Amino acid sequence: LRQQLQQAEEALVAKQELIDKLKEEAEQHNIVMETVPVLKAQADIYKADFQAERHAREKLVEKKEYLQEQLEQLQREFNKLK
Amino acid sequence: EDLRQQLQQAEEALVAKQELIDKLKEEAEQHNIVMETVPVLKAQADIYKADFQAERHAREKLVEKKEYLQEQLEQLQREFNKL
């Protein structure tokens, strides 16, 4: 009897099946990975804009502190006449 | 005699089969490592978009204060211009 070699064959079919599962998953991995370029692009521009927004807003704060002391100074220059 | 000797060809396959399995099981591990790049980028896209909107909205609010402050800087100076 060669029930030894129906072992060499049982495992062998088991391995080929793993290979086929593995490949299916490598395929799925490959599709989902095509999505990365778009995600990378989206993340990049949205980070550049966020930084430009916050930049231009920082610059508003400084231009508004300035205008608060243009009023402050004009009210005190004005009040001394009245 | 040879009716048994066909594992000597089966094991020459049982082996070249972990050849693929490993060049795969280890490819799969770099497949999942680089796959981590996606929830993060996804997170950054829509979180940085949210932050951009919030910053845009605060920019908005500041432009209002900025212009409601020059509407006061004008009409007060028009009265100071009566000298």
Side-chain angles (χ1 to χ4, degrees):
Chain A
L1 266 158
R2 266 285 70 73
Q3 78 303 289
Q4 189 218 359
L5 164 133
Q6 99 107 133
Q7 233 59 309
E9 284 191 313
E10 200 145 348
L12 222 194
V13 174
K15 291 195 186 326
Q16 171 62 61
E17 277 176 359
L18 225 205
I19 289 166
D20 297 327
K21 199 161 170 147
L22 254 18
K23 287 178 166 288
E24 297 156 28
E25 296 170 349
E27 220 216 321
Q28 271 146 205
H29 170 264
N30 282 326
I31 95 92
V32 176
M33 211 83 320
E34 276 169 314
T35 216
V36 177
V38 16
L39 287 139
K40 181 59 193 166
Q42 299 188 320
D44 277 359
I45 99 82
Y46 283 135
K47 175 148 98 161
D49 291 356
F50 160 64
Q51 268 148 203
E53 275 324 276
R54 167 165 76 9
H55 178 45
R57 194 220 60 176
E58 284 161 356
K59 201 215 302 288
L60 246 333
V61 160
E62 90 196 25
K63 180 147 177 38
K64 165 262 202 176
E65 324 263 83
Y66 174 76
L67 234 55
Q68 230 130 40
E69 304 163 8
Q70 229 76 358
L71 259 206
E72 221 98 65
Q73 187 164 24
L74 193 83
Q75 263 261 132
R76 50 161 272 149
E77 203 75 69
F78 176 88
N79 268 226
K80 80 173 195 183
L81 282 91
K82 204 171 292 305
Chain B
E1 72 267 327
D2 155 67
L3 252 53
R4 82 105 255 179
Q5 95 85 213
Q6 213 47 308
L7 74 148
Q8 293 286 76
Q9 208 176 326
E11 281 135 353
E12 191 163 14
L14 250 192
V15 73
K17 233 48 185 170
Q18 231 95 178
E19 220 101 275
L20 252 187
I21 281 181
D22 296 332
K23 177 255 192 175
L24 284 182
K25 211 109 170 171
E26 279 110 287
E27 282 200 71
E29 231 209 62
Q30 276 149 45
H31 294 164
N32 287 68
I33 272 161
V34 181
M35 173 67 163
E36 282 156 332
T37 206
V38 332
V40 301
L41 261 36
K42 208 193 148 309
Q44 297 178 318
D46 43 43
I47 294 298
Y48 285 133
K49 168 177 182 154
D51 294 352
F52 155 84
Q53 281 161 11
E55 216 75 22
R56 201 227 256 138
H57 186 94
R59 192 198 180 175
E60 197 274 79
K61 288 280 164 271
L62 278 161
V63 163
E64 290 188 14
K65 194 77 201 293
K66 183 249 201 177
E67 72 187 20
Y68 149 84
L69 219 56
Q70 53 181 303
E71 276 262 49
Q72 287 174 231
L73 239 197
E74 273 155 38
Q75 58 86 260
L76 187 62
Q77 240 191 331
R78 84 167 94 264
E79 298 178 329
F80 200 93
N81 276 323
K82 164 260 206 292
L83 271 311

Tab-separated table of all heavy atoms in Angstrom, chain B residues 31-57:
chain	number	residue	atom	x	y	z
B	31	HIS	N	2.606	43.711	1.418
B	31	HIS	CA	1.331	44.134	0.853
B	31	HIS	C	0.460	44.802	1.921
B	31	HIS	O	-0.202	45.806	1.646
B	31	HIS	CB	0.564	42.970	0.212
B	31	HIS	CG	1.224	42.379	-1.001
B	31	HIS	ND1	0.864	41.148	-1.511
B	31	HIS	CD2	2.217	42.841	-1.799
B	31	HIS	CE1	1.605	40.878	-2.569
B	31	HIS	NE2	2.437	41.886	-2.763
B	32	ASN	N	0.469	44.250	3.132
B	32	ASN	CA	-0.314	44.813	4.230
B	32	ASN	C	0.353	45.993	4.935
B	32	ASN	O	-0.342	46.839	5.501
B	32	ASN	CB	-0.707	43.733	5.229
B	32	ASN	CG	-1.795	42.820	4.694
B	32	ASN	OD1	-1.575	42.045	3.757
B	32	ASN	ND2	-2.983	42.907	5.290
B	33	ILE	N	1.688	46.043	4.889
B	33	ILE	CA	2.459	47.170	5.434
B	33	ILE	C	2.221	48.449	4.629
B	33	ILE	O	1.908	49.489	5.199
B	33	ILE	CB	3.979	46.825	5.587
B	33	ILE	CG1	4.239	46.191	6.966
B	33	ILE	CG2	4.866	48.061	5.380
B	33	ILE	CD1	5.544	45.398	7.082
B	34	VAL	N	2.349	48.369	3.308
B	34	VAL	CA	2.055	49.519	2.438
B	34	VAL	C	0.546	49.810	2.384
B	34	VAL	O	0.141	50.933	2.127
B	34	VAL	CB	2.634	49.338	1.003
B	34	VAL	CG1	2.342	50.571	0.131
B	34	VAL	CG2	4.147	49.065	1.055
B	35	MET	N	-0.271	48.792	2.641
B	35	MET	CA	-1.723	48.939	2.720
B	35	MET	C	-2.152	49.838	3.873
B	35	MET	O	-3.285	50.314	3.896
B	35	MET	CB	-2.383	47.566	2.881
B	35	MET	CG	-3.897	47.582	3.144
B	35	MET	SD	-4.870	48.186	1.738
B	35	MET	CE	-6.486	47.563	2.216
B	36	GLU	N	-1.259	50.050	4.836
B	36	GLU	CA	-1.553	50.918	5.968
B	36	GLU	C	-1.621	52.354	5.492
B	36	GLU	O	-2.309	53.176	6.081
B	36	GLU	CB	-0.519	50.752	7.085
B	36	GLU	CG	-0.743	49.493	7.938
B	36	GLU	CD	0.520	48.981	8.641
B	36	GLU	OE1	1.645	49.199	8.131
B	36	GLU	OE2	0.386	48.340	9.707
B	37	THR	N	-0.937	52.638	4.394
B	37	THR	CA	-0.949	53.960	3.797
B	37	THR	C	-2.351	54.483	3.450
B	37	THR	O	-2.508	55.670	3.157
B	37	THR	CB	-0.039	54.018	2.543
B	37	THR	OG1	0.416	55.358	2.335
B	37	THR	CG2	-0.774	53.556	1.303
B	38	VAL	N	-3.372	53.628	3.480
B	38	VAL	CA	-4.691	54.071	2.984
B	38	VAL	C	-5.638	54.650	4.047
B	38	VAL	O	-6.228	55.699	3.813
B	38	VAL	CB	-5.411	53.064	1.984
B	38	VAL	CG1	-4.396	52.234	1.211
B	38	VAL	CG2	-6.407	52.174	2.679
B	39	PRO	N	-5.769	54.000	5.218
B	39	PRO	CA	-6.682	54.629	6.170
B	39	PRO	C	-6.137	55.979	6.635
B	39	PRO	O	-6.913	56.875	6.978
B	39	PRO	CB	-6.722	53.635	7.341
B	39	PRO	CG	-6.099	52.387	6.825
B	39	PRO	CD	-5.164	52.772	5.759
B	40	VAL	N	-4.809	56.112	6.630
B	40	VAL	CA	-4.151	57.344	7.058
B	40	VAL	C	-4.430	58.460	6.053
B	40	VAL	O	-4.990	59.487	6.421
B	40	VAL	CB	-2.623	57.163	7.370
B	40	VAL	CG1	-2.433	56.138	8.457
B	40	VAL	CG2	-1.830	56.754	6.134
B	41	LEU	N	-4.074	58.238	4.793
B	41	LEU	CA	-4.376	59.178	3.733
B	41	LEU	C	-5.884	59.529	3.690
B	41	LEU	O	-6.268	60.701	3.585
B	41	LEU	CB	-3.902	58.598	2.408
B	41	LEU	CG	-2.562	59.042	1.807
B	41	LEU	CD1	-1.467	59.314	2.829
B	41	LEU	CD2	-2.089	58.022	0.774
B	42	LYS	N	-6.732	58.513	3.796
B	42	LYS	CA	-8.158	58.727	3.916
B	42	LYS	C	-8.472	59.675	5.087
B	42	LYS	O	-9.233	60.629	4.925
B	42	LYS	CB	-8.869	57.388	4.093
B	42	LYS	CG	-10.273	57.370	3.572
B	42	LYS	CD	-11.012	56.134	4.048
B	42	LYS	CE	-12.514	56.402	4.243
B	42	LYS	NZ	-12.800	57.607	5.089
B	43	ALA	N	-7.864	59.422	6.249
B	43	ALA	CA	-8.035	60.263	7.446
B	43	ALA	C	-7.590	61.698	7.210
B	43	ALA	O	-8.282	62.636	7.599
B	43	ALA	CB	-7.278	59.672	8.632
B	44	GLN	N	-6.429	61.850	6.581
B	44	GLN	CA	-5.852	63.150	6.290
B	44	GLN	C	-6.650	63.936	5.258
B	44	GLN	O	-6.848	65.139	5.409
B	44	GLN	CB	-4.427	62.982	5.795
B	44	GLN	CG	-3.506	62.383	6.814
B	44	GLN	CD	-2.114	62.188	6.275
B	44	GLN	OE1	-1.926	61.748	5.141
B	44	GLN	NE2	-1.121	62.518	7.092
B	45	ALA	N	-7.098	63.264	4.202
B	45	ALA	CA	-7.949	63.921	3.217
B	45	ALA	C	-9.147	64.552	3.930
B	45	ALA	O	-9.305	65.773	3.901
B	45	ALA	CB	-8.395	62.963	2.136
B	46	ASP	N	-9.968	63.761	4.614
B	46	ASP	CA	-11.195	64.365	5.114
B	46	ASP	C	-11.089	65.154	6.422
B	46	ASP	O	-11.907	66.047	6.671
B	46	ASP	CB	-12.410	63.426	5.033
B	46	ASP	CG	-12.100	62.040	5.471
B	46	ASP	OD1	-11.412	61.936	6.496
B	46	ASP	OD2	-12.543	61.075	4.803
B	47	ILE	N	-10.058	64.883	7.211
B	47	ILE	CA	-9.781	65.701	8.411
B	47	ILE	C	-9.137	67.040	8.053
B	47	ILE	O	-9.521	68.076	8.592
B	47	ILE	CB	-8.952	64.921	9.499
B	47	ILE	CG1	-9.775	63.752	10.077
B	47	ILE	CG2	-8.442	65.847	10.611
B	47	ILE	CD1	-11.088	64.156	10.830
B	48	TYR	N	-8.174	67.031	7.138
B	48	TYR	CA	-7.593	68.284	6.669
B	48	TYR	C	-8.553	69.117	5.826
B	48	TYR	O	-8.391	70.327	5.734
B	48	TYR	CB	-6.308	68.042	5.900
B	48	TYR	CG	-5.142	67.705	6.786
B	48	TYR	CD1	-4.293	66.633	6.491
B	48	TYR	CD2	-4.883	68.454	7.932
B	48	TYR	CE1	-3.219	66.326	7.306
B	48	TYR	CE2	-3.809	68.153	8.752
B	48	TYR	CZ	-2.987	67.092	8.434
B	48	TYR	OH	-1.928	66.815	9.269
B	49	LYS	N	-9.541	68.470	5.206
B	49	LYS	CA	-10.601	69.179	4.509
B	49	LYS	C	-11.493	69.884	5.537
B	49	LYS	O	-11.854	71.055	5.356
B	49	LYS	CB	-11.409	68.224	3.635
B	49	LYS	CG	-12.697	68.813	3.089
B	49	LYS	CD	-13.402	67.852	2.176
B	49	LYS	CE	-14.656	68.491	1.617
B	49	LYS	NZ	-15.074	67.927	0.307
B	50	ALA	N	-11.836	69.169	6.615
B	50	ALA	CA	-12.580	69.750	7.734
B	50	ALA	C	-11.820	70.918	8.353
B	50	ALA	O	-12.410	71.960	8.640
B	50	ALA	CB	-12.870	68.713	8.775
B	51	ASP	N	-10.516	70.761	8.546
B	51	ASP	CA	-9.725	71.835	9.145
B	51	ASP	C	-9.669	73.053	8.238
B	51	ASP	O	-9.630	74.173	8.721
B	51	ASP	CB	-8.305	71.364	9.480
B	51	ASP	CG	-8.272	70.300	10.569
B	51	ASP	OD1	-9.329	70.022	11.193
B	51	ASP	OD2	-7.170	69.734	10.795
B	52	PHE	N	-9.655	72.813	6.929
B	52	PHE	CA	-9.616	73.865	5.902
B	52	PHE	C	-10.914	74.658	5.925
B	52	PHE	O	-10.919	75.879	5.775
B	52	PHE	CB	-9.389	73.244	4.506
B	52	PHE	CG	-9.916	74.082	3.363
B	52	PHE	CD1	-9.150	75.123	2.825
B	52	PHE	CD2	-11.184	73.835	2.820
B	52	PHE	CE1	-9.638	75.909	1.759
B	52	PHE	CE2	-11.677	74.624	1.763
B	52	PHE	CZ	-10.893	75.661	1.236
B	53	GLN	N	-12.014	73.937	6.108
B	53	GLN	CA	-13.317	74.555	6.233
B	53	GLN	C	-13.443	75.386	7.504
B	53	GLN	O	-13.984	76.489	7.460
B	53	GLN	CB	-14.404	73.510	6.153
B	53	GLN	CG	-14.646	73.109	4.744
B	53	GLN	CD	-15.361	71.787	4.619
B	53	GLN	OE1	-15.857	71.243	5.607
B	53	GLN	NE2	-15.424	71.259	3.398
B	54	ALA	N	-12.934	74.874	8.621
B	54	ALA	CA	-12.985	75.610	9.870
B	54	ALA	C	-12.119	76.859	9.772
B	54	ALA	O	-12.488	77.929	10.243
B	54	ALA	CB	-12.561	74.737	11.028
B	55	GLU	N	-10.975	76.731	9.128
B	55	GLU	CA	-10.063	77.840	9.042
B	55	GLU	C	-10.617	78.882	8.083
B	55	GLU	O	-10.491	80.088	8.316
B	55	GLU	CB	-8.693	77.355	8.581
B	55	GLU	CG	-7.549	78.105	9.229
B	55	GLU	CD	-7.317	77.692	10.674
B	55	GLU	OE1	-7.741	76.568	11.059
B	55	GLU	OE2	-6.700	78.491	11.422
B	56	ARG	N	-11.231	78.404	7.005
B	56	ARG	CA	-11.939	79.263	6.071
B	56	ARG	C	-13.079	80.044	6.757
B	56	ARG	O	-13.321	81.208	6.441
B	56	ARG	CB	-12.496	78.418	4.933
B	56	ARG	CG	-12.804	79.183	3.689
B	56	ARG	CD	-14.144	78.764	3.232
B	56	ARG	NE	-14.093	77.864	2.098
B	56	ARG	CZ	-14.851	76.779	1.966
B	56	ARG	NH1	-15.697	76.406	2.917
B	56	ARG	NH2	-14.732	76.039	0.881
B	57	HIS	N	-13.768	79.394	7.692
B	57	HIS	CA	-14.887	79.999	8.415
B	57	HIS	C	-14.418	81.042	9.440
B	57	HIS	O	-15.107	82.020	9.711
B	57	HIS	CB	-15.704	78.911	9.116
B	57	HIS	CG	-16.953	79.420	9.767
B	57	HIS	ND1	-18.178	79.413	9.133
B	57	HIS	CD2	-17.168	79.944	10.998
B	57	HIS	CE1	-19.094	79.911	9.946
B	57	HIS	NE2	-18.506	80.244	11.083
